[PDB]
Design a protein that fits this description.
- The structure is cut from a larger assembly and holds five copies of chain A (about 350 residues).
- In chain A, helix 1 crosses helix 6, helix 8 crosses helix 17 and helix 8 packs across helix 19.
- Chain A is α/β, with parallel strands linked by helices and about 350 residues long.
- In chain A, the strands form two sheets. Chain A has a five-stranded parallel sheet, covered by helices on one side. A two-stranded antiparallel sheet of chain A has the order 4-5.
- Chains in contact: A-B, B-C, C-D, D-E.
- At the B-C interface, helix 6, helix 13, strand 4 and strand 5 of B face helix 2, helix 10 and strand 2 of C.
- Bound molecules: adenosine-5'-triphosphate (5 copies).
- The site of one adenosine-5'-triphosphate has 14 residues of chain A, from helix 10 and helix 15.
- One adenosine-5'-triphosphate binds next to helix 10 and helix 14 of chain E.
- Chain B binds one DNA strand of 8 nucleotides through loops.
- Chains A, B, C, D, E: Its EC number is 5.6.2.4.
- Chains A, B, C, D, E: It comes from Simian virus 40.
- Chains A, B, C, D, E: It catalyses: Couples ATP hydrolysis with the unwinding of duplex DNA by translocating in the 3'-5' direction; ATP + H2O = ADP + phosphate + H(+).
- Chains A, B, C, D, E: It is found in: Host nucleus.
DNA sequence: TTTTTTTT
């Protein structure tokens, strides 16, 4: 009896899988008895346990096929085709709206009954992040709209401050929230072409840790990056399309994505200073160090790195109207959860503790 | 029954699509019952909502096919094949006439009942552009004549001026108008081999901000561009066919397109200067800057970059006799719509406002 | 019923096509009723309207087929096979005789009843070329013999002088006449290898403006050209076979064709000097400059650089016995047409006009 | 009603054709009625007229097939396979015995009833050749045996010095005689590692004007040639197998053929120089130029570069005992014809003219 | 009826053929009747005449097949798989035991029914091999222990001493008995890092003459050798797995095999010598060069290079118990064939002919 | 499988 290629493709769509080998392996597992499946019973992975029951029948026939890799190819093509349709047609607002739906799906599992994540510890993260910069929550909302509107010239933000001052931590959480990529531009100029190649179809980019020239008088090690950026004006201003390259692959032409730049106190040419919308100073604050020293579970679980943490901050601080209308229904349910889960006083006690440099919890 | 490969080919032809994945993803959207299609109801994409109902039945059968990518590859071949047939058999004038028809179709949508753009905002951009150079519309017609005739060794125009004097802005508009590609010649002198490969079958090309060398009193970063261009005199001259290459492709051969070179005020080896028909000196101007600062919607919607803006200028300024005969019919209708919309006094008000450096609209 | 692959192959033989996409594109056009076919009614392209009625019945079936690119590939390889058989078995004289029939056929169209070209404008071109050098028509007869005899280490002519001397123009016309290829050697020493692969099965080749070294003493930037050719002596000599790459293909092995090298004046190693059988120096002549400046349809139609103009020059000047015996009938016909179409006095006055730098015509 | 792939393969064997396009082109000629075949009637090519009638019926059925290239690919592979099997099984003396039978069969045609050339002219060539250096036939007989006995690190003779010494002239004739290959050392060593792959299954090889270093006293431009000679010294010595590259097929390892190499009088180290046997740089004899100047049909017909000239010279001079036994029949058969044509006084008269700078005949 | 794919696969295992072209070619020969197969009748090639009669029926049907190359590809895969299994499963001991069995089978063939070799020739070869230093049969055998044992550190000896000493000739000869390869060492380690990877998967390895840094100052031309291996702490030592590259490949890495190094009488820093268990000076000693000046067959038929000569030096001097335990049966029988034909005294005449430079054969 | 890349 015949295999349904359709049922495979539906699984690939719903897992959003795009690796042929990864798709193949997981479908083959469904061939074993669903009714006894140990992986189902232990509820180990949703991509398995949500689906084994449905696909078991087809997986048995799949296991006898001789066309196995061919079936998977057509399935994975369908997922890649969907992405390319989306990329060429969605509004940037709708792109973001999808991305939040994915994070909210993950949170539903994480804080579920089988979920590992301690909603209390993750809210300790938000308390710490909200201390990192004044008006933190508004700053995020401003950055977000800036990426969505993507207005020419008004496109790029500068993070400035000493080593161990948090700028990478915040950048990483934003990049997770938005699904960009990091880039390094300190290379010899000829090398840049495949670096910039990374940007293709990305929503954000982060230029990490740009080195200037001079300031080794202040022990800042010198390098190319500042001068390279001054030479890339059209990519920053983002008014016109540019050509981007990948290894073995034809060039593609597109608007260069908006993004973030991070540095120590190198001297910045006035040319570059005109490019940035906002400069944010990061400074080491001694009380945060002593707090982290007493609340290491933040680092151990990588809480303060995560876009998941920033999304919780937005849900706590921003009005429901500020989110894209379609997801507001989920937002209200999460607001309701958090309102039930914490009094404002217990949350505010954490902020006070962080200001004491004391461990977050008491 | 069975898939009609013919219907898929027709869809590819009508959408003028030449990505196999985009075609695949697009066609798959039609598999759902037409009568409920929210994309149709929301009138989001004409390349969807025109076609769903017609293609529906075959899209459902296609969804079951075991052969899907083969069908799409054949369809994309016919679209690519038509481009090559046209490249060899059309006159350069006919090409331009076709390109204009496409832009005019986009203009029918933009300013159509879907109401999706403001014809007044777009007309403001023409005022700002008609300021950017003396006799601006005459310069466009001369450039168009130059590009249609394609006189050998009289094929290239040189743009120079300081930074911030609009030259890439003007190049971008001409490039969207004609169709073509930009190129970067400041590369290492080997990968030029693949860089120049982008010129294949194009109509224009633009070489962007070619770096000269030395004279650093000019405060100009040095690079390969000028000396490297002087090693490519042949490609400018366009007197004989040349050989062109892409990744994994064996060489095409054809005449290298006509086009534009842009640079800062470096000094030119006159052997290359001998290959430029005409040279245009851009100046920074204050009232442009002040007007533009008070007219930001121009930039926020990329109006002054966009080929539609130049086409609107020609329609306003030029006699109907100057257009190729078949589109004179559409040109007349657009002229009527413009004169209906705008008095000459309104246009003169706008131009005076640009000259006054106030926000254009008053 | 089924597609005839044989009929497709026959059309490819008839058209002497080579791009599988060009073949595919053009054959698809026949699917519409030739009865109505607008292109036929315009009589626009002979490659179409001579064949549409014949191929229509089979094109309708081809339009449905699932194999289309496969059918086309077989036909293209049939044409390529024919070329290889010809290349291995014709005398060089017969090859040229075939090539001349192709030009004569086009000329029968050029000045046919459809008569898109004016024979008087085209004859004006011949006068300008005959003026360009001493004994021009004798020089052309010499060059043809040299290329046909293909005597080893007596195979290459060097053109040199200043810029705008016309050397490229003359090369371009000779190249068109014999149907060679043009090659660049001012290039990366590695990728020369795929570059030279173009010359497989070609009758003739031309190297363009081969850059010398130490040239900038004379205002000429130095380059790879001479530095490359001094290696390739065996390719010039044509005394022994050499082996030729193509991308994704194993090497051919054959004698490298005879040809021409152009340069602006540079120092030549005496080793390389020994391998050019003839030297020609070209000089600017301001009366020619003024004449083209008036008679600019010469440039716009590219008349002065067509091999058709050289063929016409030979027809006017050379005895019929100098032509290969087969074509002598068509030669007598065209001689008679031309002697009828122009007096000697007309041609004499054209020369005086050109000599006097006035526009050619009065 | 079906193609005999066997009959196709027999033609490929009997022609010893080993190019798939060449065979394809060849066989398709047979589809027309051999009855009318102008090539047959003309006795145009033996590869045609011997075979047309035999293969006609099969060729008509082949002309309709849809597998045409696949059929030819299998046929070509049997030819390459046969070469490989002979290549390892046969004695080096046995190889030459086959090669000579090939050339003799050609001479049968050249001087046949078709008689397209005449032994008169060719013997004048022999006179010019045997004149060129002392005792020429003997030193050829030596070089032959050297290549049969193939002593390791003793496999190579060299010629050096003046341009137009004739060293290429001598080399080319030897290569046409043996059926070796020629290769170029002067490319980047990496490219050589692929290029040397052509040496597969060759009795003999040569390399021409390999660019050494120094010799600037003689204005010789230095290069990578000797660098890569100094590299490949195992290939030179043939004391061991080494690997040989191909595209789309495995590289194969075997011992390397013997040969000749030639250069201008560059430097090259004695870690080479000592190896070689019986090297002769030889230098001009001007009166030969003057005979040549008067006997130019030699060069036009490439006679003094044809290996057929050498074979005629050996037939003329050498005892019948000097040759392998089977061919001694045909040796005598030809040696009769030389006597039957020529008195000694003919050859004597020729060598007077040659010695005395007049054209060979009087 | 149909081709047995199985029978074709047997012949590949039988002949150990592993080239698809050779397999195809030889198998096609069997299509004629073995019954009067003249190759069989002449007994020329066992790889033919041993098999023809069995395979004939299958070969006839094979010659009629249309899939022929596909059949052969599978058969060659079989032999390749068979090899790759053994390469992973077996000990160096077992591997070397098989290798002796093969070379002893070549010994059997050489001195076989044909008498194609006369062992006295190889006694003279062995007598020459004996000359170099005392008991060197044992010292070879003891090195071969070091090779099989591959005990860490205890892996490497150094062949010091000048040109033509045979030291590379002998090191190469072991590659017949054992496989392996030699490599250069005289760039800075910088480049040699791209060259070390040819040591991968080698049974054993060899290294060419270590130059001293600036060694021209020591009258031995320069190259950066010693300071490279002064500092490659581990590579010759070989406890744990090393890291390596073949230029433009990847770091598949494992143990660095044991091997030989040589030098042309250069100097040695301590950490270079620490790489070896031994260092020995090799010279082209006076009577030895004189005996080669007087003894020729030992070079002419490559005896001095062949592994067969090394095997016989061991059979002539190593006692049976030292050999591969089952092969010792054959070792006795060859020892018998030695003693059957030579006393040690007649062999001592040869030793003394070498020892006093007079020609060996006597 | 090459090609492109990588090296350069
Ligand atoms: N504002 C801060 N005050 C004190 N300590 C900080 C602060 N921000 C970060 N930290 C400490 O610095 C460590 C590294 O943080 P982070 O990577 O964000 O710093 P950074 O300045 O962006 O570094 P880099 O420039 O190296 O990428 C954190 O794990 C934490 O221990
Ligand atoms: N003539 C002008 N005078 C003043 N400001 C100008 C002028 N033209 C452009 N601008 C401003 O400069 C910005 C950049 O324009 P554009 O990028 O085309 O110029 P450019 O710097 O000269 O270009 P290029 O990249 O070719 O060197 C515009 O978006 C506008 O804000
Ligand atoms: N002898 C001449 N006298 C004056 N003008 C000339 C002459 N020959 C050519 N021209 C002008 O020079 C233009 C370029 O000619 P052409 O490209 O053949 O010259 P070239 O010497 O080969 O140049 P380059 O070195 O730039 O390739 C022609 O189109 C014509 O306008
Ligand atoms: N003995 C000779 N005297 C004069 N000219 C000679 C003599 N031998 C050969 N030549 C000339 O040398 C020309 C080229 O021959 P060939 O290519 O064999 O020489 P070559 O020394 O190998 O040259 P190169 O080093 O330039 O390749 C011949 O066409 C002939 O005219
Ligand atoms: N002891 C010897 N004396 C003289 N000649 C010898 C001796 N041994 C071998 N030969 C001959 O010299 C040739 C070269 O020997 P080989 O290359 O092995 O010496 P080498 O000392 O390793 O030299 P190099 O240091 O130059 O590589 C041998 O193949 C053989 O023909």
């Amino acid at each position: 009896k015949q295999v349904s290629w359709k049922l495979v493709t539906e699984y690939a769509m719903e897992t959003k899988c795009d690796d042929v080998l990864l798709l193949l392996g997981m479908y083959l597992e469904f061939q074993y008895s669903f009714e006894m499946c140990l992986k189902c019973i232990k509820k180990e992975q949703p991509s398995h346990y949500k689906y084994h029951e449905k696909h078991y029948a087809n997986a048995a026939i799949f296991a006898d096929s001789k066309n196995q890799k061919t079936i998977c190819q057509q399935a994975v093509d369908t997922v890649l085709a969907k992405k390319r349709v989306d990329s060429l047609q969605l509004t940037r607002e709708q792109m973001l709206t999808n991305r939040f739906n994915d994070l909210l799906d993950r949170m539903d599992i994480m804080f579920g009954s089988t979920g590992s994540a301690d909603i209390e510890e993750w809210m300790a993260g938000v308390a710490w992040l909200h201390c990192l910069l004044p008006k933190m929550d508004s700053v995020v909302y401003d950055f977000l709209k800036c990426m969505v509107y993507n207005i020419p010239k008004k496109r790029y933000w500068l993070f400035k401050g000493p080593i161990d001052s948090g700028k990478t931590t915040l950048a990483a959480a934003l990049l997770e929230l938005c699904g960009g990529k990091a880039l390094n531009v300190n290379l010899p100029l000829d090398r840049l072409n495949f670096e910039l190649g990374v940007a293709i179809d990305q929503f954000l980019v982060v230029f990490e840790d740009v080195k200037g020239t001079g300031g080794e008088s202040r022990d800042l090690p010198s390098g190319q990056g500042i001068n390279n950026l001054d030479n890339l004006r059209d990519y920053l201003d983002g008014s016109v399309k540019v050509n981007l390259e990948k290894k073995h692959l034809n060039k593609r032409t597109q608007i260069f994505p908006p993004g973030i730049v991070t540095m120590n106190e190198y001297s910045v040419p006035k040319t570059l200073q005109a490019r940035f919308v906002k400069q944010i100073d990061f400074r080491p604050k001694d009380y945060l160090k002593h707090c982290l020293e007493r609340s290491e579970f933040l680092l151990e679980k990588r809480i303060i790195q995560s876009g998941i943490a920033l999304l919780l901050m937005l849900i706590w601080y921003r009005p429901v109207a500020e989110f894209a209308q379609s997801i507001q229904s989920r937002i209200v349910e999460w607001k309701e959860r958090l309102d039930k889960e914490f009094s404002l006083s217990v949350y505010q006690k954490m902020k006070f503790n962080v200001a004491m440099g004391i461990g977050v919890l008491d």
